[PDB]
Design a protein around this ligand. Structure first.
Ligand SMILES: Cc1cc(CCCOc2c(C)cc(-c3noc(C(F)(F)F)n3)cc2C)on1
Ligand SMILES: Cc1cc(CCCOc2c(C)cc(-c3noc(C(F)(F)F)n3)cc2C)on1
Ligand SMILES: Cc1cc(CCCOc2c(C)cc(-c3noc(C(F)(F)F)n3)cc2C)on1
Ligand SMILES: CCCCCCCCCCCCCC(=O)O
Ligand SMILES: CCCCCCCCCCCCCC(=O)O
Ligand SMILES: CCCCCCCCCCCCCC(=O)O
Ligand SMILES: CCCCCCCCCCCCCC(=O)O
Ligand SMILES: CCCCCCCCCCCCCC(=O)O
Ligand SMILES: [Zn+2]
Ligand SMILES: [Zn+2]
Ligand SMILES: [Zn+2]
Lengths: 238, 252, 285, 29, 285, 238, 29, 285, 60, 29, 29, 29
């Protein structure tokens, strides 16, 4: 017969190999495929869809819808801070968002992130807020003035309820680790009162705000890995 | 004349009437980042002549017992005009350099300085287990480090010039861009190095790309020792560009 | 070119991401950053619209993020145990009601879609533990008993003849067994979720248990009784090939508790039941 | 069972068994 | 000719060295032997310039001195030990923080460059020592847990399911496992050296430990507890393929002491710490 | 199936084999390659660069820069010997030079060697020295006259600080062993005072000289092997 | 996946797996 | 025709011998049978010249008598022994100063020429003797340490890392290891004999030991210490491929006594030291 | 993969077989071959040369 | 690496490894 | 023993042994 | 070493070793 040289690796089973194998059901003809709406061909499709950020997930809020809203109200001190979180797509509180969950199935990420905010107050409630992205190499801003020096958007509340702040991919390396790693921590998003929350008389003195996230045209994930956002500590039985 | 050189950068012009030619690290002249190699997407800032100019550091005194000196870039220029300002207001920076070392004596003096530009000169510690050189010690600024002076501290780097402060033999530093200032032949050294890194841009605060090492391999001698013979360093950024603007970073 | 496409496969550059173009300062009454999430659509604003960007040639590819790639990695779905303790006839064979619901890792990934259609690659990893010292000559038989076919009730049941059912015989020392399976459903796609019953009474079953019957995997140690007792554990691995998925959904947020059901348990302190980590307050990064 | 291409870079997409289920991972898009 | 180049590969005559030409006596004010090392350049004088040489056809080739060849030989980078002493559950699995810094031989060669980009070929050599006599049926599982993925904490941790991570199962008696890895960095090349930190304070880390995180290699004996205890030592071998290196540097002159750092130790008599052998005097060959 | 004959060597693992193997990270796309100055494609590139010879590595000098310099001074006896070492590229003191270190990673060597010397004295210091290469088959020369009969260069110190002596490849065999082997010992390089070291009054009476080495266009190494110029006598830990 | 040459000396540079990382040592220069 | 030559290879009819032609009675003053051996030439007379021959078509071929064939058969050149007696660390590894002078059969054939150039095929036959009963899992490592490379001095010496040297790992149960070696000399051909020294004094070495250094073959049992002691004997076989030989010489007529030297011993009755059998007298067939 | 049938004789080592095997010294370039007088290509060449017969080889 | 001949009797002289040392016994004369 | 087809989709129906009994399952109709 | 035929039914009579003795059973008549 044809002389052969069995190479190292032979007989091994690598869970990510791509070989062919004999079919246990010869001659079997699969059911005709029918059209079903909603087919997904690539996970990027899911990363481009907004999902809510449980940004207000304090211990007392977790387990309640309120963990998804941020409260705004008339201020007595100017330029007060509203919220602050890390930009890292897989860090908390971004972790459980759809894009955060998918990012947790990969080791590397890159691209620009899209953060959106929808004002939930009354039609007669006005407000101007400053949303800022602080690139790394410095601590989170301690004031609006400090934050404003970075990438930002001044949001004026009006007929259009939602605003978007894009966190451009500003990194030394082409990719970053999805897991919380010092070297690749991408920065922060802070929110500050630009002017103030103002309302006419007989109008609720507080209002909620919803926060969304999704990836831009340049978002991309790399190196598939198992997620640490879900576990199994016992047998799943019948 | 091939013994003369004039280097003009921004509003500065440096001259030397006794050079030993010049060196262009790895034969690559500094150039701005191209869109094919770039990764950060915001438009970069390029100060041009207000940053790409010669900055002269504190002079050092060379004597019969000098063991050497080293500086790290961009650390050494952290407090130099516009260039310095830019490295702290931005997350990312990228730059090449023209390093001109100056040292004159007389036709009756003798001594030899090995002038080297090392990429990623990761310093070592000696007999201290896995404790590494502290940030403070590898960020001396324009003052640099005077080999053989610092009163040891745990996080202090190796001060062994014969082992390149990193576990390798001095005799082999010549594999890096370098020149010699042999008092009998020249009174200056000129090295032009491009940006070198595994990423297109980087943090000017936590990553020193190049290290300038000066070791007197041939001892300074003359019959007029009282006349001080200084060594002066003038560095000029080239194609300096920064990205990711924000508040100014404050170290320490 | 079937050859140019080949190169893209080897380099994994089939699905490239768009470049970022240089943008400039703007002053206009067209405000891309403003929209209305109420519409249910995602604002399609890109970085070039909110800041002055430079031109950058993207080199990232979405290949690895494809459904084929996401569900195309072999993971454990069952750990069959044959432990000879004190009765070879009773302990040398067993059976398993086949399903992809017992192991959380692969289950969660499939469940990120409502429907999925794919062929399967099954790979088996048998390991014989020598409880008394030797393992002799171990030969295993794995037989797929489709729903309806007779299930063996003894190690010598006539069903082991496998006159029609597919059986795979493995001999200790030989490479790991492996075979492919074609899309098996009587429907066009597998139901990852099913909001229906198998009847209309208070006692009708609910969920995928109604639509996902896959039969039984029967196995036995072919080798007859030996002096030294062994414990053979066969771990089954599954991988989807030639995959299609429809209607993506929220990822499982709490631990699974049972098969074919979305049921879950909650403790008195729910923050312990989800991956969400309590924040000190709104402004503590 | 080979889908022989040419360019010379001759691609050889071979299906060793006579069932579609038997072949390896699919191509993208 | 893609075929003429083929012959050069088989014969290893891709990179030929130049011939020596016949030279003659000279008298000139052009003195090649004289130059200035201060310039930082190497005098490019050749033998034909300093003596009267004959004509000689060179047959030497530089192929073997190529970077691909220099770094393309498989060397040991880790010796994993699973030693069953008195507790199978605790001793039948382990983990390793992956790195190419633990073994001096291959480390020194890579460190002769500042940056290197290459794919990897990993080959494993497992050997089961029969401490009590038999080894039964040994099956091993090696799983690559990228940074972030859950690390198993028991021999039956759900992470071993490997629903996404790559795992390689080896069966004693079968050939040595082997697989390839694509260039893994988030940068364009691996840092052999890194004069930087992961912060700007007295407590920030220094060196390649900041840039070279590669994850964890977890392994376990798949086979369940057996009567006779064994000691499985798996030695990992690495080789670079499709290599590129930049900025050559001085070779390590003293013994390595730790990973990711250039730290070293010196004795009271430094000549013992380097390969340099003391000379009797300047004129003693 | 196709009848095959498993050949001897099968299943073996040879550390220098060149086989293909399945990729553990299918679909993974590596980071775009960017231009980095200083790429090296062949070690010969490093062998052609001068590096200093620790020629004065006496026990008392090792660990000091002085191990790299040779001192010259006014002589009272004529034609005195200055230094003498073996030419063998991997012998001491050439061993730790870059070309010596690289040569130590191979078993065979061939080609011509380039030795350079830079005078470190004052501009008013003059000197004529004779650098000689003694081909094998004879002991090292015991005098300048004896050395001068072989390959040599008379170096006149002047405006150009450096001189080079080429040690031509003069061997019976096309290659030699890099390790110290009798049969293949290549000879010696000795240095002698041709005239004398002369200086005007008020000028230092001694001067240093630096010694360099690199390979010529015909230098070549063969048969890769592990180096004995570096070792590991214990575990390298984290 | 074969880069078939001709000259008759027909070279057959075959890539058995669909990943560049999988192939053997590179060619020189 | 590259195909007609192929047939000759399969049939082994590449080198045919000439035919015998019919000859006739002769009467001439040209006497072929007479000549002068003093000239140092061999009389080229053929059978047709001394008798009346018939015509005969020769079918014999000289293929098998070719140098390639004569030296192209794998023969034993070394029998390495690792015998675990009472100290695993000291007895589980060894080394051999490589040479083709220890076994008489292949040595005599090569020595029928003065110089020879050839590539080599090395084949190893390891056999594990179970001294106490079991052999467990035996894995061997063979490493070629070229002259100059560090020689391991313990079973765990860093040299075993083989970061550059070639090593071959064999696993008991797998086929016999084998690999090829290119012509290794620094000269154009190997010296089978060398009438020279490595110096010019009374203490200089004489013979091929001066020119035939080939390095050291180091080996060890990779498997760590096991309960039952084994004795592994690895026999090395060598074969020349792509061979050329020059200047044939007289075959070794007496037993060999040492390597690299033609030295021999004589007894008091020399006819016992050579293959020559004493004849009763000149006329006793 | 391609279905194969391992034939009898496989894995055996026959000292007179003629197989190929991987080279332990990849990239190694052998010393140039020089002309040496006296090359022999076939043993028949040696059989055609006269040599003396120890025809009078009595014990004494 | 095949020296394909033709005559139809197509000879296939294949070199499996990229080193000359690796090939089998040489041809005669 | 190969029934090589073409279309390029080149079918390779190979019979490894010289007996009809040796080949696999038959084609339909 | 293949006696490639054609008809398309391409016969491939392959001789794996270079000795006539090595080939299988002979053809008839
Ligand atoms: C949804 C969905 C899709 C599926 C199919 C899961 C695959 O299950 C199997 C397995 C694991 C093995 C066999 C099998 N066929 O033959 C053999 C034998 F070799 F083990 F006998 N095992 C058959 C099915 C349907 O289950 N749920
Ligand atoms: C610089 C630099 C480059 C590298 C990569 C080293 C290779 O490290 C590994 C190893 C040895 C094995 C795996 C691996 N992947 O799958 C497996 C399994 F089969 F073992 F699971 N092991 C992954 C990496 C990144 O480390 N430092
Ligand atoms: C004359 C003449 C020619 C020769 C060469 C003899 C072959 O010797 C060897 C052997 C037997 C094995 C190796 C060898 N290379 O790799 C290995 C490993 F796998 F054993 F490590 N062994 C190297 C040489 C030079 O010796 N004398
Ligand atoms: C010229 C043809 C070479 C013959 C060897 C072909 C080996 C590939 C066999 C696979 C055939 C696929 C069978 C169908 O589909
Ligand atoms: C005429 C074709 C002969 C068929 C046998 C081909 C064997 C080589 C298979 C390797 C194919 C590479 C796959 C891609 O790349
Ligand atoms: C039409 C081509 C069939 C493809 C199968 C070819 C199998 C032979 C592989 C040997 C290639 C030699 C490599 C070089 O040399
Ligand atoms: C160009 C031809 C490639 C040679 C490899 C052919 C492998 C297939 C061998 C099967 C031949 C069938 C024998 C008859 O029938
Ligand atoms: C296009 C050619 C495919 C290459 C694979 C050929 C496999 C058959 C090898 C047998 C060669 C016979 C050697 C002689 O005779
Ligand atoms: Zn037993
Ligand atoms: Zn036993
Ligand atoms: Zn036993």
């Amino acid at each position: 017969g044809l002389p052969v040289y069995v190479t190292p690796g032979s007989g091994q089973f690598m869970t990510t190999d791509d070989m062919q194998s004999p079919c246990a059901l010869p001659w079997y003809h699969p059911t005709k495929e029918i059209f079903i709406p909603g087919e997904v061909k690539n996970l990027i499709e899911m990363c481009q869809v907004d999902t809510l950020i449980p940004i207000n997930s304090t211990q007392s809020n977790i387990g309640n819808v309120s963990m998804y809203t941020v409260t705004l109200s008339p201020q007595t001190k100017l330029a007060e801070e509203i919220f602050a979180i890390k930009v890292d797509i897989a860090s908390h509180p971004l972790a459980t968002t759809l894009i955060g969950e998918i990012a947790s199935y990969f080791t590397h990420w890159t691209g620009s992130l899209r953060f959106s905010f929808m004002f939930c107050g009354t039609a007669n409630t006005t407000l101007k807020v400053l949303l800022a992205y602080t690139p790394p190499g410095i601590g989170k801003p301690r004031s609006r003035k400090e934050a404003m020096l970075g990438t930002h958007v001044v949001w004026d509340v009006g007929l259009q309820s939602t605003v978007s702040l894009v966190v451009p991919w500003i990194s030394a390396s082409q990719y970053r680790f999805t897991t919380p790693d010092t070297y690749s921590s991408a920065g922060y998003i802070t929110c500050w009162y630009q002017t103030n929350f103002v309302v006419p008389p007989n109008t609720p003195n507080t209002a909620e705000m919803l926060c969304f996230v999704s990836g831009c045209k340049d978002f991309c994930l790399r190196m598939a890995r198992d997620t640490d956002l879900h576990k199994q500590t016992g047998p799943i039985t019948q | 004349s091939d013994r003369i050189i004039q280097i003009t950068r921004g509003d500065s012009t440096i001259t030397s009437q006794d050079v030993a030619n010049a060196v262009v690290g790895y034969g690559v002249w500094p150039h701005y980042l191209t869109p094919q190699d770039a990764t950060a997407i915001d438009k970069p800032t390029q100060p041009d002549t207000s940053s790409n100019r010669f900055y002269t550091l504190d002079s050092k005194m060379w004597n019969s017992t000098s063991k050497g000196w080293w500086w790290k870039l961009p650390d050494a220029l952290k407090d130099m005009g516009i260039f310095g300002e830019n490295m702290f207001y931005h997350f990312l920076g990228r730059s090449g350099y023209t390093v001109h070392v100056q040292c004159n004596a007389s036709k009756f003096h003798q001594g030899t300085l090995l002038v080297v530009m090392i990429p990623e000169h990761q310093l070592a510690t000696v007999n201290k287990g896995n404790v590494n050189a502290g940030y403070k010690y590898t960020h001396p600024g324009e003052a640099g480090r005077e080999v053989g002076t610092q009163v040891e501290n745990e996080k202090q780097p190796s001060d062994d010039n014969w082992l390149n402060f990193d576990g390798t033999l001095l005799g082999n530093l010549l594999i890096f861009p370098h020149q010699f200032i042999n008092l009998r032949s020249n009174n200056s050294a000129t090295l032009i190095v491009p940006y070198v890194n595994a990423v297109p841009m980087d943090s000017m605060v936590r990553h020193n790309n190049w290290s300038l090492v000066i070791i007197p391999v041939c001892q300074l001698q003359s019959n007029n020792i009282s006349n001080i013979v200084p060594i002066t360093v003038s560095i000029s950024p080239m194609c300096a560009e920064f990205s990711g603007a924000r508040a100014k970073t404050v170290v320490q | 070119n079937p050859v140019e496409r080949y190169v893209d496969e080897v380099l994994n550059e089939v699905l490239v991401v768009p470049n970022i173009n240089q943008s400039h300062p703007t002053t206009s009454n067209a405000a891309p950053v403003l929209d209305a999430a109420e519409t249910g659509h995602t604002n399609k604003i890109q970085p070039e619209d909110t800041i002055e960007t430079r031109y950058v040639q993207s080199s990232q590819t979405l290949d690895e993020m494809s459904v084929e790639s996401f569900l195309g990695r072999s993971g454990c779905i069952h750990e069959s145990v044959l432990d000879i303790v004190d009765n070879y006839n009773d302990q040398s064979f067993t059976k398993w009601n086949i399903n992809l619901q017992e192991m959380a890792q692969i289950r969660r990934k499939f469940e990120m879609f409502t429907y999925a259609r794919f062929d399967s690659e099954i790979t088996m990893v048998p390991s014989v533990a020598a409880k008394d010292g030797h393992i002799g000559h171990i030969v295993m038989q794995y037989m797929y008993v489709p729903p309806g076919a007779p299930i063996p009730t003894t190690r010598d049941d006539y069903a082991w003849q496998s006159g029609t059912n597919a059986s795979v015989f493995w001999q200790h020392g030989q490479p790991f067994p492996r075979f492919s399976l074609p899309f098996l459903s009587i429907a066009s796609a597998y139901y990852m979720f099913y909001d229906g019953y198998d009847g209309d009474t208070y006692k009708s079953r609910y969920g995928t248990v109604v639509t996902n019957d896959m039969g039984t995997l029967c196995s036995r140690i072919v080798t007859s009784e030996q002096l030294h007792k062994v414990k053979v554990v066969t771990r089954i691995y599954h991988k989807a090939k030639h995959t299609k998925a429809w209607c993506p959904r929220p990822p499982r947020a709490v631990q699974y508790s049972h098969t074919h059901t979305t049921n879950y348990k909650l403790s008195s302190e729910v923050h312990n039941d989800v991956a969400i980590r309590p924040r000190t307050n709104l402004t503590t990064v | 069972g080979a889908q022989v291409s040419r360019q010379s870079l001759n691609y050889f997409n071979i299906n060793y068994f006579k069932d579609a289920a038997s072949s390896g991972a699919s191509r993208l898009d």
